[PDB]
Design a protein around this ligand. Structure first.
Ligand SMILES: Nc1ccn([C@@H]2O[C@H](COP(=O)(O)CP(=O)(O)OP(=O)(O)O)[C@@H](O)[C@H]2O)c(=O)n1
Ligand SMILES: [Mg+2]
Ligand SMILES: [Mg+2]
Ligand SMILES: [Zn+2]
Lengths: 83, 48, 580, 21, 63, 237, 710, 226
RNA sequence: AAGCGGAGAGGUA
């Protein structure tokens, strides 16, 4: 698209993210579920391995899990089954 | 009682819209139809 | 973005800062970190910077009359004790900076943050959910800047001179860079007609069709424009593939441009264009030269003659009454008519006297603020005043606020301000009570499914057949037919179909319908839906705030009540301004 | 005036006051 | 009866409810807000709460 | 005294002839005393060469169209006014452009005299179709800035000499902006972003380097009033 | 707040009260201006809240009858000659005569210039009648306005709303440290300060014998001597500072009724509530958008707008069943680094600077089963600081009057100076009001030709639509007064200066002039004075005949393209400061019946999330934000601690529970003899009565109800 | 055409603290930016010396009074806020003021150490009637800009110390006037006249030298780009 | 290891 580089909360653009789902209300749960999975993986790193995997994309210097989840949704590394 | 529900709905929506159009306020008619729809959902029982 | 004081940020984010202090080994336990935060050691401002990044906050201002009273922003630490708010979000909140205050809330869990970051962000809510008109657009000073910039004044410096003999053209330029260099040297004005060679701006429709036709690949294709430099500098702010406008920017023109952008482009483009317009408007409002002084307030040249002419007639009526011909009411009505006519005549004389570059007239003419009644009151003649009961006092106020009212003219003029101040404080209760009842009646109407497959619907007039042999568009057609799905095929002349069933009625559909010659239409309405509980997304139609078909799970029964009850309450608290 | 040590503040007024506050 | 009681005329509503022995299904917005669970609108309906997220096979295998 | 924070100059190469420089962290209020001076010095201080007048045979009285050529006089003037030429000689130099036959007359047929060089040979000037002939005489001089058209002095002698504007400066566009940085707990320092776009004869880095050598020698005049003055020192590199 | 507010608190007529009206069920015909209020009750000054029209102020000349009816003075006119006899009339009688207007054209001999005059008839109607039957006249203009409304220059050029706002806002100004007097004002300031009672006035003539900062000793003419003491740095009802300073020398001779010492907001006997500032009127870069104000940095360096605020704290040592509380130094285990400022027997030392969380007086209370003691010393609340001025200690040992069961009472006074900063509120006399949006360095403000920067910038989009153009007239006249003028009358006198009193044809720089309320300077006289003004130290005239100057740009240096309106204006600092309005909280005290946070700033209190905000959240569709707001952040007693622990330890936030308010509601419904039950999917009403669940207290630190000890 | 002239600087004295400086011939348009660079530098970053704290004999804080002195402490501090002093040492230096008996305490009763001078020896500070004695101790330091008061407990000072606000810049007023020579033939140039008035603590020619040194140091970042 | 309810008055948006 013909837009300047987004900065902060506006990256990735919501116009691209909204093509991966069917509603604006499914994206919230999609990202929240993925973020919870990432956090659960992170905080039990020292103990017995858990099924949850991630992050799939290379994280930044210090990034909160929600941005990682959104950047994985944008890169098309996940898939969800609406219930 | 005389004409019917459709005439009542037309009358209500038009009468409500006139007041707001006089002062210069724009509201799409779809916002006044939920309320009017909610005002017509019952029946009085005559013989049981 | 928003600006947050360091003290408030430090107090709202205590648990996160304590966790980070323990993690980086700046403390030894959780009891040490709490004391370190309470005593505000210099080791607490190092981590606060990176613990608030990408964590949104919710800002709220009371009363919350509609949805856009709460919005989510990204915080940035500032020095001081006041919250900094963007200029463009002051119309949704209805906030001005003379003593207002706001409240700040913080989301905690992952779902709360996702909702604040996806649903409630301030860059996603630019259109009004009640009519679809943009709410984050230039206003006040920005309108004045954009109106000064894009204006052409005849006879200015460097104007194009179409002559021959000695100097061929004297005013054609080779690029905007050369024009800017000339303006810097002071041999040109940004409001003088010139001819430029543009290469990175798309031509209008007619020029594009006549010159290139197939496609104007604007990256490198050149054309000649006949315009001012301010208009080029204004067009360099709109998206790359947006045709050249070349008009003076009254407020309505800016509103139409914003509407078109929001309708045809994604949201990031509009959110990034409004900021550029803001910057340019603020920059050029300082150079516009609008200032108020007692010399700018001109007066009619012939007020005395008009006033004496009407005073003679008033005296005639009074004498006739005294002789015994008229009663009291007839005398009052005659005097009221005479004085209203006199005030209108003086207003017309004033409007005719004023020049066109006066700040007093320019501010109102550009659509920025105010009306002409206030200008007439300030520089012309106040007119007729009312009574405590509401009637008209036969004696008028023949002096403006520029000359200064006398003692009893100033006394009988206080009857009309007390009434406004008292009604403003007594009708708001009625407005709020009505809004609460409306919200409680219709709190269960929610979009439940996608389509009920019904054959029913309402009929909309959609323009009328003029007796002369033409069609006049219905005056109120954007509140009755726009944003509604069609219910039956629009068949004209029994020859073909213009719009098929299930099509949204936008601008092109309406224009094609009028061109084909269809007057009355049938559309799907919520009154005739067939769903047992709630409504469906096809009968309701298009969402006024987002422009797409309404989503499943929307609470369309609270937004309706808020949309109805906001304007009434808001107009109750602005009585004397301009009743309800 | 009428106060023993008041400062001098010249006035634009044209009328005369028969009575003091 | 909970919503009606919280709107107006609490005493009359409660007297009628007690005489009639009414029961409340708790399937609205006001009632859910009062008792403290998710409202049945927006991100609170079943089709949106019951979502399953898992990495794709190709991406999972790659890492 | 010492500032305690040495400023540094970065660079970002957007395009072969367009760059953005950044200076940070400047002390509070020093981003506005540098931006405007740098912009003005870049725009109207660096010398260059440009066309000053042209003479076209045939077109003597009327100034509307030249027979044999599709273009008119104004288009020819605009095409010639965007020539990127460089000259070392100080006196005015006269060059001739002669073209015959059907074809596109481009800037590569100028055949300049010694010294002057044309840096953009592939620029369209005109196009001859109806067996037209082009004979143009151009005058090239040197200067700095945007010296506009100069009224003809010896009008009677040289009747057809058409004066034009001159773009002497190699630099075409410059802009600046000022933002805020933290640099410790202060939070209110300054950062200066400067965007430069030049012509096809100099590079933006060289232009910036040449604009900061005419400003040192401008405030050297003030500094020579009193050598020992107790100013401010950034320090060694 | 200041002398004017106190003087206006009395002279106030109230319709409410026992035996009067009601604030809600009042109406609209009793809150209106009646034609019989002319001369007796001011129509402009009144509150703009729910008390509008139910509270008013007495007029300047009115008095009260023995029966209780208000009267006004009129000057009696007989057979067309205006006499000098004054008679006090009440509305009953005033409805029986015809009363002329105050500003009528008297012919310097007792006869009206023009027979046609506006008069007030029986029913309050005004009519134009020949000057033949009149029998009374007003004593003067300004006879229908109060004392606070008579201090606004150019009042007849403002609309009623903004005039009301300015009259109300003049009573909120805070005393400054210098208090200079206005350059252009009315004649009402001198009397409104002597009669308020905040100055010292000599009672009898004499020769001042000694003067200091503490007292003034005056030696009367009959051998008697009198000493006046002065109150220094005394706290006001509202926390401001009340000071008095002598303005006499050591040999001067005084007279009865002369002013001897100044007061809080007084300058040489005249009321002074603000300062004179140089103003330019223009939009500037968007920092004065929507009623915001741009300020210079010279007003912070030179303490132009600064004030002293004082605070008072109290503690009591009362008896109890287990023993007696006593203030001492032997506190339980606490670092000796914090017991440094406290003197030998408790209370802090005078002159010590204190911050938030410091100890003022050290009290210890018997804990209970000796050596069972607890710390309950007096601390400093959040966000407060300043020096300690004085300490007052009362005791029961020396037979002092104290309530029963209290042995000692201690009060500590803390003072601090306060500079102007972003968020503070400023206003003018004409209804202007705004907050400081920015404070700029001196070197990047628009400056005149001689190099003097402006002090404040006011936007031009708020003047025309609010109908208060007295401020631009005041700006013009203030510039003329500051610079001085001289009318050239060598060959006659100009036609526009025929009515100007002599001694007003020439002025020196920094003159002080007066503009009464309804007869002052006309626009012809102002336009004439603007054209004859003295130059600066050089032969330069900065402002032209229209009152506009050419300014430079402080950041770029390029001059602005058009001239701008420059002048001097009188600005006052209101008592709405941003230091008393910032508040934040994360966890603190909770209530008792319902476990929701407390409200207010005095105790750590939360912000109410009302019903309309819930409507907005439901309209957005945010179903998790609302649930989190209503359960774990407000009422869920078990979710609060778990949420805090999860946040501190970095794990995921848990799920909510059931709030306490629903349980309280069910208990009340059961107490009304109603059988409410919560059923399951197959009957079997849920117990909903707690249980034997995890009772662990992790995280050590108290959630926040109280502070944390070392 | 290329101009061979080079800009030059000349001075013209009007008084002991006012002066004018003439610069010519500049390029057309380059006359306001240079003047404003100089003016912005002169009004912010000229080093000077100022008082930093005071200590009176019998007073413990600012909100008090002295016996026999007609002013309280706060307005004595405000009167001292306008003292013009200069020093050349690089450490705080203490000055003493002692007065007894009837009279007028002015700035000429201060006895400065070696290296400090008081350039305003006639200003008014206080008045002592018959039983007032004043004994003040002042501290003087060097710096630049405006620095507010430094809290007592930050530096661990004593209890009778009274920190005061300090302003260091020795410049009073600066302005410029640009004279254009806009004629035909394209032979343009500019003249700049800069008028500087100082505080009597530094000659107006030295402030300009300091500003020029600062700017020449600062504009040297772009030159190293070579 | 420890407290925080009612009544009235005046203000800000
Ligand atoms: N009792 C009250 C009094 C005030 N308010 C709130 O404060 C504002 C008063 O605006 P205002 O009248 O003071 C100026 P404004 O409305 O912005 O119009 P203008 O810019 O053309 O001058 C309203 O928006 C109300 O929301 C309230 O909720 N209840
Ligand atoms: Mg407003
Ligand atoms: Mg407001
Ligand atoms: Zn349907």
């Amino acid at each position: 698209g013909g837009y300047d580089t987004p900065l902060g909360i506006t990256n990735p653009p919501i116009d691209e993210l909204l093509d991966r789902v069917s509603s604006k209300y499914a994206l919230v749960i999609y990202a929240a579920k993925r973020a919870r999975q990432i956090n659960d993986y992170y905080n039990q790193l020292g103990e017995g391995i858990l099924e949850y995997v991630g992050p799939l994309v290379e994280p930044g210097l210090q990034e909160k899990p929600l941005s990682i989840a959104l950047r994985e949704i944008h890169a098309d590394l996940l898939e969800h089954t609406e219930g | 009682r005389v004409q019917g529900p459709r005439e009542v709905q037309i009358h209500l929506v038009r009468e409500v819209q006139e007041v707001y159009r006089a002062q210069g306020v724009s509201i799409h008619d779809k916002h006044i139809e939920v309320i009017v729809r909610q005002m017509l959902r019952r029946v009085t029982i005559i013989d049981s | 973005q928003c600006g947050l004081p360091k003290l408030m940020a430090l107090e709202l984010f205590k648990p996160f800062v304590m966790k980070r202090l323990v993690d980086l080994n700046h403390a030894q336990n959780i009891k040490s970190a709490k004391r370190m935060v309470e005593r505000q050691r210099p080791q607490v401002w190092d981590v606060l910077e990176e613990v608030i990044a990408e964590h949104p906050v919710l800002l709220n201002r009371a009363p919350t009359l509609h949805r856009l009273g709460i919005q989510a922003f990204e915080p940035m630490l500032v020095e001081g004790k006041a919250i900094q708010l963007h200029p463009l979000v002051c119309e949704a909140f209805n906030a001005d900076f003379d003593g207002d205050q706001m409240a700040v809330h913080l989301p905690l869990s992952a779902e709360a943050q996702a909702e604040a970051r996806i649903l409630m962000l301030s860059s996603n809510n630019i259109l009004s959910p009640a009519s679809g008109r943009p709410l984050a657009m230039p206003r006040l000073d920005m309108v004045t800047g954009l109106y000064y910039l894009t204006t052409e004044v005849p006879g200015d410096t460097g104007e194009y001179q179409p002559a021959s003999g000695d100097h061929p053209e004297t005013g054609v330029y080779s690029s905007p860079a050369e024009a800017i260099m000339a303006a810097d040297r002071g041999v040109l004005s940004v409001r003088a007609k010139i001819k430029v060679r543009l290469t990175q701006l798309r031509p209008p429709v007619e020029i594009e069709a006549e010159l290139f036709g197939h496609s104007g690949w604007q990256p490198g294709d050149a054309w000649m424009a006949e315009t001012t430099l301010g208009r080029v500098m204004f067009n360099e702010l709109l998206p790359l593939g947006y045709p050249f406008v070349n008009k003076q920017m009254h407020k309505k023109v800016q509103a139409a441009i914003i509407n078109d952008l929001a309708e045809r482009y994604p949201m990031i483009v509009v959110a990034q264009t409004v900021d550029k317009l803001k910057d340019a408007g603020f920059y050029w409002a300082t150079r516009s030269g609008v200032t108020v002084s007692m010399a700018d307030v001109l007066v009619p040249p012939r007020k005395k003659e008009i006033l004496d002419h009407y005073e003679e007639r008033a005296d005639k009526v009074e004498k006739q009454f005294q002789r015994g011909a008229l009663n009291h009411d007839e005398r009052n009505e005659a005097l009221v008519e005479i004085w209203k006519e006199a005030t209108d005549e003086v207003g017309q004389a004033l409007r005719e006297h004023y020049p066109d570059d006066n700040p007093i007239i320019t501010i109102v003419d550009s659509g920025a603020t105010g009306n002409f009644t206030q200008t007439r009151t300030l520089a012309g003649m106040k007119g007729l005043v009312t009574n405590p009961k509401g009637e008209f006092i036969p004696r008028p106020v023949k002096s403006s606020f520029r000359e200064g009212l006398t003692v009893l003219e100033y006394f009988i003029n206080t009857h009309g301000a007390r009434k406004g101040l008292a009604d403003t404080a007594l009708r708001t209760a009625d407005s709020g009570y009505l809004t609460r009842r409306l919200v409680d009646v219709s709190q269960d109407v929610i979009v439940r499914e996608h389509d009920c497959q019904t054959e029913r619907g309402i009929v909309v007039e959609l323009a009328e057949r003029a007796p002369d042999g033409t069609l006049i568009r219905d005056p109120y057609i954007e509140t009755s037919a726009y944003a509604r799905t069609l219910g039956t095929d629009a068949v004209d002349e029994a020859g073909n179909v213009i719009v098929e069933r299930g099509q949204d009625l936008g601008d092109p559909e309406i224009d094609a319908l009028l061109a084909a010659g269809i007057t009355q239409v049938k559309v799907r309405s919520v009154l005739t839906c067939a769903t047992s509980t709630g409504v469906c997304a096809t009968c309701y139609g298009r969402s006024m705030a987002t422009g797409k078909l309404v989503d499943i799970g929307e609470a369309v029964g609270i937004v309706a009540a808020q949309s109805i009850g906001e304007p009434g309450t808001q107009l109750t608290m602005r009585t004397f301004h301009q009743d309800i | 005036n009428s106060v023993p040590g008041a400062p001098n503040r010249v006035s634009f007024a044209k009328l005369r006051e028969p009575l003091e506050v | 009866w909970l919503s009606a009681a919280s709107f107006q005329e609490t005493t009359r509503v409660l007297t009628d409810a007690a005489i009639n022995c009414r029961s409340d299904k708790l399937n609205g917005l006001k009632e859910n807000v009062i008792i403290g669970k998710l409202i049945p609108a927006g991100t609170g309906i079943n089709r949106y709460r019951n979502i399953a997220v898992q990495p794709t096979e190709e991406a999972r295998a790659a890492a | 005294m010492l500032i305690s924070q040495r400023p540094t100059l970065s660079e970002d190469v957007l395009t072969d002839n367009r760059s953005q420089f950044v200076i940070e962290p400047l002390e509070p209020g020093f981003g506005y005393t540098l931006g405007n001076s740098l912009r003005r010095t870049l725009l109207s201080s660096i010398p260059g060469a440009a066309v000053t007048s042209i003479r076209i045979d045939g077109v003597l009285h009327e100034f509307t169209t030249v027979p044999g050529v599709k273009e008119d006089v104004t288009e020819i003037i605009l095409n010639l006014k965007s020539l990127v030429v460089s000259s070392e000689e100080d006196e005015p130099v006269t060059m001739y452009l002669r073209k015959q036959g059907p074809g596109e007359v481009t800037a590569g047929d100028i055949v300049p005299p010694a010294g002057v060089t044309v840096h953009n040979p592939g620029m369209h000037i005109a196009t001859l179709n109806d067996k037209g002939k082009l004979e143009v005489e151009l005058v090239v001089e040197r200067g700095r800035g945007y010296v506009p058209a100069v009224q003809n002095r010896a009008s009677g002698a040289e009747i057809g000499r058409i004066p034009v504007d001159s773009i002497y400066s190699p630099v075409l566009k410059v802009t600046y902006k000022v933002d805020a940085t933290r640099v410790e707990q202060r939070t209110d320092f300054d950062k200066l972003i400067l965007d430069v776009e030049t012509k096809n004869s100099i590079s933006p880095r060289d232009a910036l380097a040449s604009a900061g050598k005419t400003l040192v020698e401008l405030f050297g005049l003030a500094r020579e009033l009193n050598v020992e003055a107790e100013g401010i020192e950034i320090g060694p590199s | 707040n200041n002398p004017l507010s106190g003087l206006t608190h009395k002279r106030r007529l109230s319709a409410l009260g026992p035996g009067g009206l009601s604030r809600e069920r009042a109406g609209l015909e009793v809150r209106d201006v009646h034609p019989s209020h002319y001369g007796r009750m001011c129509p402009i000054e009144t509150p703009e809240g729910p008390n509008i029209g139910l509270i008013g102020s007495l007029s300047v000349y009115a008095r009260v009858n023995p029966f209780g009816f208000i009267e006004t003075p009129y000057r009696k006119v007989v057979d067309g000659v205006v006499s000098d006899e004054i008679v006090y009339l009440t509305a009953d009688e005033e409805d029986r005569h015809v009363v002329a207007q105050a500003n009528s054209p008297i012919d310097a001999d007792g006869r009206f210039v023009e027979p046609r005059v506006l008069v007030r008839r029986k029913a309050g109607e005004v009519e134009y009648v020949p000057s033949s039957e009149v029998d009374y006249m007003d004593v003067s203009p300004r006879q229908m306005v109060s004392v606070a409304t008579a201090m606004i220059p150019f009042l007849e050029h403002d609309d009623a709303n903004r005039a009301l706002m300015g009259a109300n806002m003049q009573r909120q100004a805070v005393p400054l440290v210098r208090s200079e007097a206005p350059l252009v004002g009315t004649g009402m300031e001198l009397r409104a300060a002597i009669d308020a009672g905040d100055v010292v006035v000599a009672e009898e003539s004499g020769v001042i014998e000694e003067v200091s900062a503490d007292y003034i000793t005056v030696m009367h003419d009959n051998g008697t001597r009198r000493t006046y003491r002065m109150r220094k740095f005394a706290r006001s009802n509202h926390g401001t500072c009340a000071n008095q300073c002598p303005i006499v020398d050591a040999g001067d001779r005084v007279e009865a009724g002369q002013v001897i010492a100044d007061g809080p907001c007084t300058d040489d006997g005249e009321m002074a509530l603000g300062k004179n500032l140089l103003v330019a009127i223009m939009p500037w870069e968007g920092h004065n958008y929507e009623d915001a104000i741009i300020l210079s940095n010279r007003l912070v360096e030179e303490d132009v707008l600064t004030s002293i605020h004082i605070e008072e704290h109290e503690i009591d040592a009362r008896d109890t069943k287990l023993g007696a509380e006593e203030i001492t130094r032997d506190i339980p285990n606490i670092s000796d680094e914090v017991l440094a400022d406290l003197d030998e027997r408790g209370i802090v030392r005078i002159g010590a600077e204190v911050r938030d969380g410091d100890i003022l007086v050290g009290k210890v209370t018997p804990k209970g089963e000796a050596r069972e003691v607890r710390d309950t010393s007096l601390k400093v609340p959040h966000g407060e600081s300043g020096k300690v001025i004085g300490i007052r200690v009362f005791s029961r040992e020396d037979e002092d009057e104290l309530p029963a069961g209290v042995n000692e009472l201690v009060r500590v006074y803390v003072a601090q100076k306060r500079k102007i900063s972003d968020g503070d509120k400023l206003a003018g006399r004409h209804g202007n009001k705004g907050v400081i949006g920015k404070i700029l360095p001196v070197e990047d403000m628009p400056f005149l030709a001689d190099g003097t920067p402006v002090d404040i910038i006011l936007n031009t989009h708020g003047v025309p639509r609010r109908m208060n153009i007295g401020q631009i007239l005041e700006t013009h006249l203030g510039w003329c007064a500051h610079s001085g003028w001289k009318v050239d009358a060598a060959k006659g006198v100009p036609d526009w200066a025929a009515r100007l009193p002599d001694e007003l044809l020439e002025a020196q720089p920094n003159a002080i002039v007066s503009t009464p309320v309804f007869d002052g300077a006309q626009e012809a006289e102002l336009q004439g004075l603007l054209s004859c003004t003295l130059p600066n130290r050089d032969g330069d005239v900065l402002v032209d005949a229209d009152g506009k100057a050419m300014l430079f740009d402080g950041r770029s240096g390029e001059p602005f393209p058009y001239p701008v309106t420059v002048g001097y204006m009188y600005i006052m600092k209101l008592h709405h400061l941003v230091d008393d309005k910032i508040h934040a909280r994360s966890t603190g005290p909770y209530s008792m019946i319902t476990q929701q946070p407390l409200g207010g700033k005095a105790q750590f209190g939360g912000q109410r999330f009302g019903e309309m905000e819930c409507w907005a959240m439901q309209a957005y569709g945010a179903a998790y934000t609302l649930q989190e707001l209503l359960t774990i952040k407000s009422d869920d007693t078990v979710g609060r601690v778990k949420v805090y622990e999860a946040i501190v330890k970095g794990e995921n936030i848990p799920e909510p529970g059931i709030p306490e308010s629903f349980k309280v509601l069910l208990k009340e419904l059961q107490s009304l003899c109603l059988n409410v039950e919560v059923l399951s999917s197959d009957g079997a009403a849920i117990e909903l009565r707690e249980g034997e669940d995890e009772d662990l207290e992790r995280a050590a630190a108290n959630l926040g109800i109280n502070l944390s000890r070392n």
